[PDB]
């Protein structure tokens, strides 16, 4: 049975806050297709040839 993710209980209370004291500059990749292979078909020569 697959694992959905790691268990993480957030320590919520009505008067506590969590403030970051540092940071990481993270660079991530996103790959997006833009174009296809442009194809042309001669219908008569595909079906019948010569």
């Amino acid at each position: 049975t697959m694992s959905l993710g790691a268990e993480n209980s957030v320590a919520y209370s009505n008067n506590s806050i969590a403030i970051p004291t540092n940071f990481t500059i993270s660079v991530t990749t996103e790959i997006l297709p833009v174009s296809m292979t442009k194809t042309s078909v001669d219908c008569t020569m595909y079906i019948c040839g010569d």
Binding site: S40, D42, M45, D50
Partner: protein
């Protein structure tokens, strides 16, 4: 003829396909020439059951 119109707008149009035609015909058969014995089959006096 492709666009079915007498006025063709500006652009590039796929119309047909160029192909170089065959120039002559060559027939290549085996050089051995033997008279084929169809006379033994169809002119036989008696056939089998």
């Amino acid at each position: 003829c492709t666009l079915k119109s007498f006025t063709v707008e500006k652009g590039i149009y796929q119309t047909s396909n160029f192909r170089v035609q065959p120039t002559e015909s060559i027939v290549r058969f085996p050089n051995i020439t033997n008279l084929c014995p169809f006379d033994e089959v169809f002119n036989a006096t008696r056939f089998a059951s």
